[PDB]
């Protein structure tokens, strides 16, 4: 509830709704050893390691999907090679947890969450047992929040959707369904392109499409940039078809043995 | 496994506070907040003076990370604002640096009473009274209580471009569950006292009820003799002022969890001659004033009925000679000490 209605004024929209090019150019030093294709696989990978962690520990979505954002941000800024994201996955939900008032995670329950959700749903791609102890939890969480220049406060596409349901009075027909697109973007890099209104409404508009609910005047009744919004679904369709032609299971281990090494102290 | 040129390059172009600032000597406070320095730039762009506050402890606490979090957002000028934050790897301390702020309310406030014996300006109660208001407001809109609102925490700039400019400090980031629930109590709410499971708008604009009186007469409205939210006493002076609440005052009070140990603690025959109108006739404030009636609307006991920060500010109070200044001391020479300094 707290800023809920900043978002203009926000670090989220000033700093971090990043340029599509120079978010490119950043990555082209991880696609040297990397495919663009590997690349989004392991970002599609990394986004249910997330998942999977905050559902273990009993966190709600919004909890869950400011972690999944500070992850994007660290690696969209540095390369894969600089902290081993298996360790900063896990610190992005224990510093995502802290923000939020209602309950804290404690050191042992992080750790026995990590060690617990790798070996038991990710066993395909980790064969080694989790690591790292606490210790480098709290170290590599001052560089999480170095880089993302104390950046804490995120504002997702939960909230306005709820209101744009609402405003439809649609909310038991499309809502169920238009929450769990908004679960799937995060797959992708939407959530550093674009503000959470428009990916909202992009993801109410496949709700519709997908169950031939007829909303095409309550769409034309809004004051918004379509072609960005038709920008977005694109994106969303086009995760379907990549959805349907990965197998993560079969192809991980193998990708995640490309990504580059952080280099050791000589 | 972190990378090693990634790590000694963020190690070579990382800025250290003890680089940066000199504040050998300059403490100005410690608490349990943790240590603050009046602190001078090293490399001399400005010659301001800086706010320099080591957080208590190591590591990012659930208190640490909120305060870090909602201050990065927060921009009014009325609420102290964030500069930058510092991460020292080596002890794992956090620092934090803000614009210093000479003058409190509190040290304002027990000079004018110090002196009284052993508010000068004129409109400086109501102008810090608008300040306070607009700044709550700015909170309470974006959702964010204060829920510590005292004289200590509402700062006041001293000689410089800010100079008179009230600026709101030490909000109650962490409260777990935002829970009163999980020593001085004389600006906290009735409701707090009674049992109240969480902070509120309303006990915020309480606060600045108590605040606001204190000004007027130099006393603490509610001051009291030094776990659990029952607190009989500070209860019993609130009562000696404010008179026993009427069943029409404030309904709801059967709903408190604290309701039946009043009832057995306390009866209403015993402040029958008590009032607000009574208490500030004893220490000169006028009963048909607007600065009184305005007090009466934020001093309201049932927190259904206490006025709001944005119905405050929209008060008559505001437009009647005189008008509130943006400077507090109205371009008058300022008459308070500077802070001292402390040891280690
Ligand atoms: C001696 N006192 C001093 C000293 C300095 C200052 C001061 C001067 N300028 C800027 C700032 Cl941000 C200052 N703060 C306010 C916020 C605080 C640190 C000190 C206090 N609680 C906390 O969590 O952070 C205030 C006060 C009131 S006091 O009576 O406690």
Same mark, same amino acid.
């Given at each position: ?127 080694? &047992?989790?690591?790292?102890? =606490?210790?480098? %939890? #709290? +170290?590599?969480?001052?560089?999480? !929040?170095? /880089? ?72 034309? &009744?809004?004051?918004?940039? =379509?072609?960005? %919004? #038709? +920008?977005?679904?694109?994106?969303? !369709?086009? /995760? ?27 | ?344």
């Amino acid at each position: 509830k707290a800023m809920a209605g900043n978002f203009w004024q926000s670090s989220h929209y000033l700093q971090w709704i990043l340029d599509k090019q120079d978010l490119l150019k950043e990555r082209q030093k991880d696609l040297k050893f990397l495919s663009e294709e590997e690349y989004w696989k392991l970002q599609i990978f990394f986004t249910n390691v997330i998942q999977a962690l905050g559902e273990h520990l009993k966190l709600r979505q919004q909890v869950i999907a400011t972690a999944t954002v500070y992850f994007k941000r660290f690696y969209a800024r540095y390369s894969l090679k600089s902290i081993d994201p298996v360790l900063m996955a896990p610190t992005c939900v224990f510093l995502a947890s802290k923000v939020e008032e209602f309950g804290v995670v404690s050191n042992t329950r992080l750790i026995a969450a990590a060690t617990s959700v790798l070996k038991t749903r990710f066993s395909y791609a980790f064969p080694k &047992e989790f690591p790292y102890r =606490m210790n480098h %939890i #709290l +170290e590599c969480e001052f560089y999480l !929040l170095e /880089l993302m220049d104390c950046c804490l406060i995120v504002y997702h596409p939960y909230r306005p959707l709820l209101q744009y349901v609402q405003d439809m009075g649609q909310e038991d027909m499309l809502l169920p369904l238009a929450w769990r697109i908004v679960n799937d973007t995060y797959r992708t890099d939407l959530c550093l392109l674009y503000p959470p209104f428009m990916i909202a409404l992009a993801c109410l508009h496949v709700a519709c499409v997908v169950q031939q609910k007829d909303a095409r005047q309550w769409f034309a &009744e809004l004051s918004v940039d =379509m072609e960005k %919004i #038709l +920008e977005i679904i694109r994106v969303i !369709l086009k /995760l379907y078809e990549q959805w349907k032609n990965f197998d993560e299971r079969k192809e991980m281990a193998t990708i995640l043995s490309k990504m580059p090494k952080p280099k050791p102290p000589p | 496994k972190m990378d090693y040129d990634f790590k000694v390059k963020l190690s070579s172009e990382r800025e250290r506070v003890e680089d940066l600032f000199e504040y050998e000597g300059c403490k100005v406070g410690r608490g349990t907040y943790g240590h603050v320095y009046k602190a001078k730039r090293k490399d001399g762009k400005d010659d301001k003076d800086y706010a320099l506050k080591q957080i208590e402890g190591t590591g990012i606490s659930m208190s640490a990370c909120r305060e870090i979090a909602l201050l990065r957002e927060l921009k009014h000028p009325n609420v102290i604002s964030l500069q930058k934050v510092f991460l020292s790897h080596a002890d794992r301390k956090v620092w934090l640096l803000f614009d210093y702020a000479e003058h409190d309310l509190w040290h304002i406030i027990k000079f004018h009473r110090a002196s009284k014996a052993n508010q000068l300006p004129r409109g400086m109660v109501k102008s810090l009274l608008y300040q306070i208001l607009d700044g709550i407001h700015y909170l309470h809109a974006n959702w964010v209580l204060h829920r510590d609102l005292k004289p200590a925490n509402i700062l006041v700039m001293g000689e410089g471009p800010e100079r008179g400019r009230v600026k709101i400090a030490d909000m109650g980031f962490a409260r777990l569950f935002n829970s009163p629930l999980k020593v001085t109590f004389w600006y906290r709410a009735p409701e707090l006292l009674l049992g109240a499971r969480h902070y509120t708008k309303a006990i915020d604009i309480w606060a600045i009820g108590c605040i606001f009186a204190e000004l007027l007469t130099s006393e603490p409205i509610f001051h009291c003799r030094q776990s659990n939210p029952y607190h009989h006493d500070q209860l019993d002076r609130i009562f000696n002022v404010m008179g026993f609440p009427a069943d029409k005052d404030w309904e709801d009070i059967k709903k408190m969890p604290e309701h039946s140990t009043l009832m057995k603690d306390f009866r209403r025959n015993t402040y029958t001659n008590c009032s607000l109108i009574k208490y500030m006739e004893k220490h000169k404030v006028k009963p048909d004033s607007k600065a009184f009636h305005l007090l009466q609307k934020l001093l309201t006991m049932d927190p259904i009925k206490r006025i709001t920060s944005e119905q405050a500010m929209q008060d008559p109070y505001f437009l009647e000679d005189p008008l509130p200044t943006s400077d507090v001391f109205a371009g008058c020479q300022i008459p308070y000490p500077k802070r001292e300094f402390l040891t280690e």
